[PDB]
Amino acid sequence: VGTFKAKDLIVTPATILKEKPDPNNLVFGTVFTDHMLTVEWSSEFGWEKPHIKPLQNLSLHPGSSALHYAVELFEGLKAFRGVDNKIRLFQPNLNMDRMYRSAVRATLPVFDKEELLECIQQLVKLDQEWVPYSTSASLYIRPTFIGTEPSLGVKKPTKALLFVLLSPVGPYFSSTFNPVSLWANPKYVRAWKGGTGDCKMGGNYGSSLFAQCEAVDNGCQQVLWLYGEDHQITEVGTMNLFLYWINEDGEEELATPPLDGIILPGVTRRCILDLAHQWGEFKVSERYLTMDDLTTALEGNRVREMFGSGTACVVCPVSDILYKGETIHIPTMENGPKLASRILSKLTDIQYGREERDWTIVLS
Amino acid sequence: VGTFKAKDLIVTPATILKEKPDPNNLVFGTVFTDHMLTVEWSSEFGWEKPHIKPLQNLSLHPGSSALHYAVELFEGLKAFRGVDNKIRLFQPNLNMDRMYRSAVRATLPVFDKEELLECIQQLVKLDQEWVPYSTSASLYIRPTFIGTEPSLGVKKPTKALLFVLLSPVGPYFSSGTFNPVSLWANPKYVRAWKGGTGDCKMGGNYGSSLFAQCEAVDNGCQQVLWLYGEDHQITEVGTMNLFLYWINEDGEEELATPPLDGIILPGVTRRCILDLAHQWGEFKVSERYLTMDDLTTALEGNRVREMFGSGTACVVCPVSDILYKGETIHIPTMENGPKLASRILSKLTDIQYGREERDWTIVLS
Ligand SMILES: Cc1ccccc1Oc1cc(-n2c(=O)cc(C(F)(F)F)[nH]c2=O)c(F)cc1C#N
Numbered sequence: 026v027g028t029f030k031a032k033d034l035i036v037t038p039a040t041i042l043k044e045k046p047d048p049n050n051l052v053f054g055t056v057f058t059d060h061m062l063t064v065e066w067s068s069e070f071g072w073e074k075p076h077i078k079p080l081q082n083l084s085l086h087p088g089s090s091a092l093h094y095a096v097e098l099f100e101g102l103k104a105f106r107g108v109d110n111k112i113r114l115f116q117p118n119l120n121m122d123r124m125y126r127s128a129v130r131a132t133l134p135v136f137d138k139e140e141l142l143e144c145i146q147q148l149v150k151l152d153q154e155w156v157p158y159s160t161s162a163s164l165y166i167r168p169t170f171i172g173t174e175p176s177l178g179v180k181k182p183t184k185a186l187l188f189v190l191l192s193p194v195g196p197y198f199s200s201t202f203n204p205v206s207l208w209a210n211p212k213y214v215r216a217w218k219g220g221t222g223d224c225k226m227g228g229n230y231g232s233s234l235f236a237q238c239e240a241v242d243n244g245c246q247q248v249l250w251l252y253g254e255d256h257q258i259t260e261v262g263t264m265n266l267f268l269y270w271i272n273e274d275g276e277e278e279l280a281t282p283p284l285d286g287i288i289l290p291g292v293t294r295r296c297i298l299d300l301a302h303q304w305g306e307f308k309v310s311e312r313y314l315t316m317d318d319l320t321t322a323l324e325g326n327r328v329r330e331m332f333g334s335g336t337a338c339v340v341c342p343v344s345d346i347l348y349k350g351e352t353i354h355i356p357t358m359e360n361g362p363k364l365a366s367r368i369l370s371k372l373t374d375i376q377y378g379r380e381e382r383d384w385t386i387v388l389s
Numbered sequence: 390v391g392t393f394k395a396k397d398l399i400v401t402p403a404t405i406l407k408e409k410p411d412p413n414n415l416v417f418g419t420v421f422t423d424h425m426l427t428v429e430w431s432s433e434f435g436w437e438k439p440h441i442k443p444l445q446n447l448s449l450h451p452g453s454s455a456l457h458y459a460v461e462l463f464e465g466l467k468a469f470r471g472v473d474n475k476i477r478l479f480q481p482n483l484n485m486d487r488m489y490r491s492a493v494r495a496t497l498p499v500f501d502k503e504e505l506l507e508c509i510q511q512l513v514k515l516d517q518e519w520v521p522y523s524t525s526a527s528l529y530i531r532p533t534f535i536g537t538e539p540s541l542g543v544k545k546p547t548k549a550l551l552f553v554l555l556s557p558v559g560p561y562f563s564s565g566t567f568n569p570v571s572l573w574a575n576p577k578y579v580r581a582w583k584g585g586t587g588d589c590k591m592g593g594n595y596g597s598s599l600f601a602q603c604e605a606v607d608n609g610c611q612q613v614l615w616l617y618g619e620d621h622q623i624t625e626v627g628t629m630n631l632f633l634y635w636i637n638e639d640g641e642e643e644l645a646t647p648p649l650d651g652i653i654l655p656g657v658t659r660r661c662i663l664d665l666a667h668q669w670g671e672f673k674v675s676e677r678y679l680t681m682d683d684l685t686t687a688l689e690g691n692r693v694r695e696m697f698g699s700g701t702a703c704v705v706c707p708v709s710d711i712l713y714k715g716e717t718i719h720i721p722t723m724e725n726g727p728k729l730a731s732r733i734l735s736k737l738t739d740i741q742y743g744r745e746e747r748d749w750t751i752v753l754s
Pocket residue numbers: 053054101165230237246247262263335336337338541542543544
């Protein structure tokens with residue numbers, strides 16, 4: 026159980042550089058930078074020295090376990106060009122923690138978290154002009170970890186590739202807030218107790234595409250993932266779910282589903298709970314929320330705001346849920362949205378260096 | 390929509406051929422033949438013409454959805470060199486049915502099932518000397534279907550590759566005789582859930598299983614017994630369907646297997662075994678729920694005869710033991726012959742190797 030070291034980085038700069046895209050006409054994860062990180066592993070020799078080199082196709086054996094048994098995991102984090110023109114990562118330690126834990130659950134080989142971070146930092150530094158010159162755009166960092174075992178045997182891989190892509194992304198909505206409609210159909214399940222839903226393992230995402238297409242066919246933008254006999258609301262697509270409301274006890278509450286195995290422990294989710302705890306202005310509950318809790322609250326005018334949280338869209342307001350053939354209105358946009366707007370501004374201010382924070386590291 | 394057609398096959402023969410492996414010293418899925426099938430798809434142009442060409446690395450964009458969101462599915466079926474030296478596929482139509490259905494559930498593009506079969510048949514024909522000269526070995530056919538979308542967007546792919554590998558494989562167990570397995574039963578891990586993809590051969594179902602398989606091996610077990618629900622239903626033996634041969638609660642001789650309620654992969658071998666047992670008409674055949682309590686209650690009453698896994702891998706794999714809640718539970722399969730397991734093995738083996746005629750076999754094109 027060794028590791029690749031950032032000290033050993035072999036840098037092959039590209040001799041031909043690509044034009045950067047317009048920040049205001051960007052489709053998410055469509056455009057890639059000049060360079061990538063790649064690190065080879067084998068059971069026989071362990072970690073090879075890491076490479077920063079030009080973006081290129083991967084040459085994979087067609088038996089590679091990533092292609093057959095989804096022996097794969099990824100991360101998502103961003104680099105932000107601040108108002109002071111300094112580039113910052115946001116809580117990147119939490120991403121490295123989550124990637125390591127996911128690697129263990131996948132049986133992919135462990136690595137030193139600080140060494141991968143330093144390798145990512147060198148990659149973003151070389152491609153730093155790709156971090157858009159825009160206070161509403163970012164560079165998406167996609168660490169990826171794949172089994173490359175050339176064997177059809179269902180086993181712990183004896184060959185893996187860890188690589189990192191960079192992709193400049195614009196504002197989540199090309200437009201201020203575009204509130205989403207959620208397609209809520211309990212027939213589909215994202216994740217289950219005893220499953221891998223609390224990891225960013227590829228297997229969790231492939232099974233979701235069918236339901237996402239069903240959502241789009243019914244003029245919704247995301248899936249509301251329901252779970253269990255009592256229809257728990259768990260996640261908004263690939264975003265954590267927050268409910269701002271008067272609870273059953275008549276108390277002002279920010280509620281989110283708890284980490285009981287079926288929720289991806291989001292970085293944004295952690296940051297929002299940390300903020301709401303620190304503010305000390307209302308109750309903060311990691312607790313179960315059902316469609317009946319929600320509809321009961323809406324008939325009693327107890328619901329203020331619902332929003333998704335994630336690296337993608339820091340705070341994504343929900344306006345409507347389609348469920349049992351009815352459109353259910355969530356009055357998020359008629360209540361400001363006051364708290365969603367405040368949370369967006371606090372995280373945005375930290376990300377873009379408008380305010381100092383422990384949560385940000387300036388680029389190496 | 391539309392489909393690639395076998396009539397459009399572009400064949401690029403290999404100019405250098407590899408030596409075949411020893412039929413008696415084969416490891417599953419480690420050795421590959423001279424050629425592969427590849428077919429490109431895009432939303433813009435649809436299916437390109439299929440290629441049979443030398444085995445080669447795939448050139449994939451590192452954003453390919455197969456690498457990120459497991460936008461992928463596979464099949465497993467075998468070609469058998471029979472006692473009459475004729476090469477036979479076994480129920481290959483059922484594999485094409487299952488691949489199509491899996492493609493729909495994955496949001497990968499549909500294709501004509503007959504055209505893929507004919508493409509596979511041409512591939513196996515060109516590489517037919519790879520079908521081992523051994524009546525206890527096979528050629529494993531691995532159809533694979535991957536999203537190759539160069540975009541990190543979590544979406545229906547606008548780019549896919551369908552390809553087929555061939556791998557000569559020996560008997561499941563080296564000895565050729567039954568090597569009975571121990572199952573590691575830990576309810577903490579769940580293979581599949583209602584509203585999930587457990588009834589498809591989608592890659593996502595398999596990645597989550599490796600950790601549990603390693604836990605099994607660490608406790609001297611060979612396979613995972615997949616438990617489900619508050620009452621601990623026995624569902625599957627690793628990547629094999631589960632059969633229980635026993636006296637049921639009604640005092641009747643019964644072959645039981647869990648039913649296709651969404652959390653069971655509809656196995657070809659599973660279908661063949663039910664078809665046989667129905668046809669024989671010698672005992673009750675029940676697609677029904679089986680719990681660890683049903684099993685342990687039956688063992689206390691000496692009501693259990695045989696437990697076996699079923700699958701293309703190991704036609705019939707006897708179970709001798711289950712580790713569950715820190716106790717070793719003995720299944721007396723090997724002390725009861727195993728009579729039914731042995732009969733089922735013989736019938737399917739005889740069909741596969743052309744010892745007996747059947748509708749279930751197609752001779753090679
Ligand atoms: C790429 C990714 C995978 C898994 C979890 C999170 C994640 O991050 C993002 C996801 C998305 N994204 C999609 O790719 C598709 C959808 C649709 F709704 F269409 F399914 N929604 C989305 O938010 C995005 F647009 C941006 C980011 C970012 N940053």
